[PDB]
């Protein structure tokens, strides 16, 4: 989890 | 060759590094001038109004380059050859952290509070400032990335590569918009305006590039083979400001006519131009730091208003 890259959503 | 350059009594006292000066930079307001030097790596800031140094702060390691985040002298970021980024607040040292691989040069995107690391990795690291967490990595798929620049006009991020290929990225949506193809390594890369870009080569050729057309608009070759470390743009006289260690050349953007050339006693590490003035500040491999005033290029800066009387 420390290496999991977070994902963003275009607003 | 009718420029007849001056060389400078003492405008600012103790405008002298101990042995050498690596980088000299000026704040956007113009009241602060910052310089770093070996030995005992220092951060020395000189007040334009007071003509004296405000403070000095020694460092653990030599700083390859530093960039001024704040409008004033308050917030500054240093990148080290020891993979270290040190943050300095107004009072002094604030926070320090490392990166997995060495960083050649770094650029900060003022929108989105994202600060970019270009270095000895194919991936280009990204730093968010509003949120402490490191952002997602982006892979430039080239072995070594040398230089980077961000255009203030519309936010375009382009990184130089060891193979000589310039790769442009999009700060928003993190997508590679396109590629530019052109053995020599990319020495210097600068963004000037929306549609004009310049690439320096280790052979000594500074190349003018336009975004829409792959072919270069104009070519200028320094007869000496030394790489061009820094290229700058002067809007008022349409002059492209090209500097290498042996000599610095002044030439017009269109037709490439040469304005003048300045050769100092010892090599130049870095060159800086004060905004909207003919005064030129150069960083040399000498304890003294060069100050040169060009009357034809521009008028004297306000805090040095009396030079026009002295000429």
């Amino acid at each position: 989890k420390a290496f999991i890259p977070p994902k963003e959503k275009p607003i | 060759n009718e420029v007849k350059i001056y060389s400078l009594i003492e405008l600012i006292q103790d405008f002298e590094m101990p042995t050498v000066c690596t980088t000299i930079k000026v704040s956007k307001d113009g009241q602060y001038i910052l310089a770093t030097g070996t030995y005992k790596p220092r951060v020395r800031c000189y007040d334009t109004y007071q003509l004296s140094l405000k403070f000095e702060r020694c460092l653990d390691s030599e700083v390859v380059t530093f960039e001024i985040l704040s409008d004033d002298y308050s917030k500054i970021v240093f990148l080290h050859n020891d993979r270290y980024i040190e943050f300095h607040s107004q009072s002094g040292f604030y926070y320090k952290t490392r990166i997995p691989k060495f960083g050649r040069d770094f650029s900060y995107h003022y929108p989105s509070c994202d600060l970019y690391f270009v270095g000895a990795s194919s991936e280009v690291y990204r730093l968010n400032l509003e949120q402490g967490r490191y952002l997602n990595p982006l892979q430039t798929d080239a072995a070594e990335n040398n230089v980077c620049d961000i255009n203030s006009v519309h936010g375009l991020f382009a990184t130089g590569t060891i193979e000589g290929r310039v790769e442009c990225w999009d700060p928003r949506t993190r997508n590679r918009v396109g590629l530019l193809d052109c053995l020599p390594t990319i020495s210097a890369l600068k963004f000037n305006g929306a549609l004009t870009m310049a690439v320096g080569t280790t052979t000594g050729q500074v190349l003018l590039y336009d975004l829409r057309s792959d072919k270069p608009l104009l070519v200028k070759d320094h007869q000496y083979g030394l790489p061009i470390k820094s290229v700058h743009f002067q809007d008022s006289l349409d002059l492209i400001l090209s500097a290498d260690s042996r000599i610095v050349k002044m030439w017009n953007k269109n037709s490439g006519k040469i304005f003048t050339s300045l050769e100092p006693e010892h090599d130049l590490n870095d060159v800086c131009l004060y905004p909207n003035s003919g005064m030129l500040l150069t960083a040399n491999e000498t304890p003294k730091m060069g100050i040169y005033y060009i009357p034809v290029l521009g008028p004297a800066p306000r805090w040095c208003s009396f030079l026009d009387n002295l000429t």
């Binding site: - | 009594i9 003492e10 405008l11 006292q13 103790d14 109004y49 007071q50 003509l51 004296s52 140094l53 040095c304 009396f306």
Partner: protein, 38 residues
């Protein structure tokens, strides 16, 4: 030859500084003394 002088507040002038007013320089272990421009 203009060797030096004092302004109306008694502050001396220094050779190096080039200003019409007063500045705060580091003078002799150095302190921020206020000096008149040359």
């Amino acid at each position: 030859r203009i060797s030096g002088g004092n302004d109306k507040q008694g502050f001396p002038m220094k050779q190096g500084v080039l200003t019409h007013g007063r500045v705060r320089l580091l003078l002799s272990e150095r302190k921020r003394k206020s000096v008149r421009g040359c």
